[PDB]
Symmetry: C7
Subunit: 100 residues, 7 copies
């Protein structure tokens, strides 16, 4: 399980950081902070060792550090690292990843 | 798991695009946009790698990209790709496919 | 899994059509349409490939196309095929079949 | 699975017919129809093939046609056969049988 | 499965009879019938064949006919045999037995 | 399964007796009876034979008679033995034991 | 399972002690006691023997005594040891550990 800055998620949990919100539109129209909701696009920055549901060895999570993923609407857990914001999810809560 | 335009669903989720709504009736009578509800007919455009419930290898989803399927009434997840609309479902949520 | 007119249910779902409602009584007394509720007698016209709960091969549904079955009170899903009405159930929701 | 008059329950369901209600007492005192509730004593008249929870073959129900059983208070499903009344239960819902 | 007077519980159910309520106290003070609640002490008079959760043979219930057991507060089912009163429980609902 | 005075818990249930409540403080200040809530410290006095979840033999409970344990806040069952008070818990409900 | 001062958790529960709350800010501004909520950072001081879900031997908890862990928002159980405060959690409730 790849770690992060003095942190390591346990079991299948994955720690991600949300992408920056869109401040302006294509033509230059700029949006208020209270709008635009929450960003569902994130980057995987830490992965846990894996689950223990299957007997024997450990099954690693499908994602890896450095992947761009689409988060679900709800289910994240707020984590504060070096005054910055990160979100801890479960492995199965991730909707999908942007292959590129 | 067949991908899509810079996207790939995780586990058994399938990404589809709903068919266009019926604007006019057979005799030419046109319908207002607020009507007709939501289209339950979709086309499978992305499939995930598969579930992990069974021990060992991966069980692929029953559908494939290019299939015309009937969606359930509720259960989809809204996804935005290149400003266009797509819906992420589970593999078992699909009611059936139009064999042709 | 036996199909139907450009349709095929997925997994253990079975597509049936309900029998016609009774319009008149034995002595000729005829009933209003709003009465008689919904018909619980149906004919199996489409069967899915089967469930995947058991490891290995596929376990087919117990019913076959052409069987007269008794539907449960609730649990069906409305499907429209060639402007006609059909109902999709689960394999285990069927109460029983008329052996004849 | 022993059948009935043009009927056969599916899986572990058992079709029974409730015993006739007690109209009079031992000394001749007669009871109104609206009283006496519902009879919990029934006779097994149809049994299904069996469940499929255990892998491999089919496990038949513990009861057989012709057994006098004690029904639970709630859980039955009303079935109409030749204008007569029968009740479909699950195999595990039967409280016990009168051995004689 | 040891039976009772023309009765036999099915699966892990156990039929017991509650002990007689305490009418008087040690010093002779008598208690009203509406008081004293319900007796949690019973005697096992019928045991079922056993459950079927484990594959293969049948696992018999831990209790036997003639055991003095402590019933749970709620969970019993009322049964009437020869105008007398008995209670049907599950095997796991019994809190314990008085070894003597 | 080590028993108690004419009693034996069934399955994984464990019978304990709560410790005496604290009547006075270190400096001599005494507390009213209605206070101090309920004592979570208990002594294991009876253990059942064990659960049957695992196939084959019986796996005994982790505690033994004579162990000082910390009870959970809620989940106990009141038992009266020789006019004295005991509490029946499940094996997994015990929070921990005081090793000494 | 490593113990603590006359205490040992049973099964997969882990006993931890929360870190001291932040009284002052970096620049010297002090915070009231009623503020600052509850500390989610703790140190593992006791670990149980392990779970019994897997057949055979015992699977030990992933954490060890002396680890700095991040607690979940809710789910702990208050324990009093030598007049000091500790919290009992489950093994899977721990969000992650600070690797260092």
């Amino acid at each position: 399980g790849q770690a992060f800055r003095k942190f390591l998620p346990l079991f299948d949990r994955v720690l991600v950081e949300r992408s920056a919100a869109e401040t302006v539109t294509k033509g230059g129209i700029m949006l208020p902070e209270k709008s635009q909701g929450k960003v569902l696009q994130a980057t995987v920055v830490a992965v846990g060792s894996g689950s223990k549901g299957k007997g024997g060895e450990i099954q690693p999570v499908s994602v890896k550090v450095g992947d761009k993923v689409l988060l679900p609407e709800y289910g994240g857990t707020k984590v504060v690292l070096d005054d910055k914001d990160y979100f801890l999810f479960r492995d199965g809560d991730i909707l999908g990843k942007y292959v590129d």
